[PDB]
């Protein structure tokens, strides 16, 4: 009965669908303005290096589901996602002289492949399964568990919890190559670094826990 009167009438499920939608279109125009700060400037933009804490307002009938420590995890994945959209768009908006372009495809590929992995293979696989699960909610408690078994797993597949200084930092430091090379528009000293860190990336990730092989091809 409770789940029945909770689909509408304090529609907790409807609110949940919007949550994972207003981040993870609309949010494309929002970030592009940030590329070219102030704390009130953003609000009118939204209503239209690692910060931008985002929150939301939830009514009491759904407060018990989307807890306070649940907002931060949803915020955690949003921060990291933008840095990927950043590097992906920074190397995209533009269009031994031509030798730079060979450093573009050798790099614009790699960040693009990673982005194809986090969003499609993870942020859409578990998402497609989660919706098929909540539509069979039959309990006050288990709806928390099926939900809590969606964040604590999406925070693991997207490598952000542990093994950060062992694996995650590698993707982080090579992301700085997407910033340095973007501004300049020394060249030989980039591939010596790039061919090293990229090989450092594969020769470290080679330990593969098993789902990492979907990107290990490149």
């Amino acid at each position: 009965n409770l789940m029945q009167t909770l689909k509408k009438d304090y529609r907790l499920v409807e609110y949940l669908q919007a949550m994972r939608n207003f981040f993870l279109d609309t949010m494309y125009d929002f970030y592009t303005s940030i590329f070219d700060q102030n704390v009130s400037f953003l609000n009118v933009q939204l209503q239209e290096l690692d910060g931008l804490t985002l929150s939301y307002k939830v009514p009491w009938p759904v407060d018990i589901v989307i807890s306070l420590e649940c907002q931060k995890i949803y915020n955690q994945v949003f921060l990291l996602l933008l840095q990927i959209k950043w590097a992906k768009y920074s190397l995209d908006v533009l269009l031994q002289i031509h030798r730079m372009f060979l450093l573009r495809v050798k790099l614009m590929h790699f960040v693009n492949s990673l982005h194809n992995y986090i969003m499609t293979r993870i942020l859409h696989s578990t998402g497609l399964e989660f919706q098929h699960q909540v539509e069979e909610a039959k309990d006050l408690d288990q709806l928390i568990k099926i939900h809590y078994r969606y964040l604590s797993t999406i925070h693991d597949r997207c490598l952000l919890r542990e093994k950060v200084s062992f694996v995650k930092e590698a993707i982080m430091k090579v992301l700085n190559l997407a910033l340095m090379f973007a501004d300049g528009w020394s060249i030989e000293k980039m591939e010596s670094d790039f061919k090293n860190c990229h090989m450092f990336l594969v020769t470290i990730l080679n330990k593969a826990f098993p789902h990492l092989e979907s990107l290990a091809l490149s």
């Binding site: 372009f101 194809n116 969003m119 696989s125």
Partner: protein, 404 residues
């Protein structure tokens, strides 16, 4: 947002059928009205259309032509009222030099129209050009517009669907000059889709209405994901960065009568089919530079990964030795019948395209040695004194071939 610049009879038609396809996809009535079933639509319309106070939608299109007949026929079609009469332009009254001279002559009104259209969009992304490189109108007018546009707007993309002359068939006797000059301008100003009648009609076999219906299909499938926002590849610049001359291929190029064979169509078989030279709509161990496959319909990324793995192992493709594909997924319009379980479009950059120019260069060199049909060109101011323009263009094309 985006603008479309279509020139010559080829471009004019191309635009007609491209907008026909678009209005079919987005549920836009011929008169610009919106159907009742599509009232609550989720599809993004700003990209190619802008709505009007009368609730009708107007394309971001401009019609250009040296002759009236084609556009006059267009305005007698059921789709006539849709276009914007203000934007359409017709010359009051077949050579590249003449075309460029007119372009110099009619700068003001054309750029007036272009500016008016541009100022109506907040986030214009680039330009789309549809034209033929052989005929006098398309070649010269596109040359002039590209030059003055790259000069005017140094921060907008310029995309073209350039139609190349048939070669096996001996149409424009003076085609080598126009083609060579248009190629010069394309290299020197164009940001980024080659097209030829020969292979296009070859695949059509194995009227201009059907040929250009196929071409419009290619264009629409190319712009689908931009039209239909998703997760990845949410911008034209994303497309261009992932590849950068191009060639194209589309799997479900099936007649309205050829739906009887409802073949169980996986993603693997489609993406495979997009690789063969037969499906490449255009006609030294030449290899690829880049490949993009946009897939419409239900798709499981596990299937995509498996197909990619198998094709990689089967080594059906060849890549550059000096550098390290992409498979994007979209959603079909909710309106047109999904006669195909899953469909695929491919855009690639491959070195073999060089041969095209080698032919045209060979054609051009086969004339410049004997000064054939230069009398008309000398008439225009640009080639009134000399033809150094021609020499520079030829050397530029040679440099591009050497670079390939």
């Amino acid at each position: 947002e985006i603008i479309t610049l279509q020139l010559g009879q080829c471009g004019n038609q191309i635009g007609f059928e491209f907008w026909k396809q678009l209005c079919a996809e987005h549920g836009i009535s011929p008169e610009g009205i919106v159907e009742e079933f599509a009232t609550e639509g989720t599809d993004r319309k700003d990209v190619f259309f802008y709505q009007a106070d009368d609730e009708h939608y107007i394309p971001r299109a401009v019609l250009l032509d040296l002759e009236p007949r084609v556009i006059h026929s267009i305005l007698n079609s059921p789709y006539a009222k849709l276009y914007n009469p203000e934007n359409i332009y017709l010359s009051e009254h077949n050579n590249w030099a003449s075309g460029f001279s007119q372009g110099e002559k009619i700068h003001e009104d054309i750029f007036d129209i272009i500016d008016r259209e541009a100022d109506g969009s907040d986030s214009l992304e680039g330009f789309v050009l549809c034209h033929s490189i052989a005929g006098g109108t398309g070649s010269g007018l596109g040359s002039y517009l590209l030059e003055r546009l790259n000069d005017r707007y140094p921060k907008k993309l310029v995309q073209t669907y350039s139609v190349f002359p048939n070669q096996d068939e001996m149409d424009v006797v003076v085609q080598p000059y126009n083609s060579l000059l248009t190629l010069k301008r394309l290299t020197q100003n164009a940001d980024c889709v080659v097209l030829d009648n020969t292979a296009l009609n070859r695949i059509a076999t194995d009227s201009f209405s059907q040929i250009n219906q196929l071409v419009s299909t290619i264009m629409s499938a190319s712009t689908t994901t931009l039209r239909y926002p998703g997760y990845m590849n949410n911008d034209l610049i994303g497309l261009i960065a992932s590849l950068i001359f191009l060639m194209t291929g589309y799997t479900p190029l099936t007649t309205d009568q050829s739906v009887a064979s409802v073949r169980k169509t996986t993603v693997l078989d489609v993406m495979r089919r997009l690789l063969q030279p037969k499906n490449v709509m255009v006609s030294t161990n030449h290899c690829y530079i880049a490949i993009l496959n946009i897939i419409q319909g239900e798709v499981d990324p596990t299937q995509v990964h498996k197909s990619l793995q198998r094709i990689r192992e089967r080594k059906l493709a060849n890549f550059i030795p000096w550098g390290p594909i992409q498979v994007a997924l979209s959603r079909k319009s909710p309106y047109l019948p999904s006669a195909h379980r899953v469909s695929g479009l491919m855009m690639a950059n491959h070195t073999s395209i060089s041969s095209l120019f080698e032919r045209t260069c060979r054609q051009y060199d086969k004339l410049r040695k004997r000064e054939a049909f230069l009398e008309q060109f000398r008439k225009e101011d640009m080639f009134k004194d000399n033809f150094d323009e021609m020499d520079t263009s030829r050397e530029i094309v040679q440099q591009l071939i050497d670079e390939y």
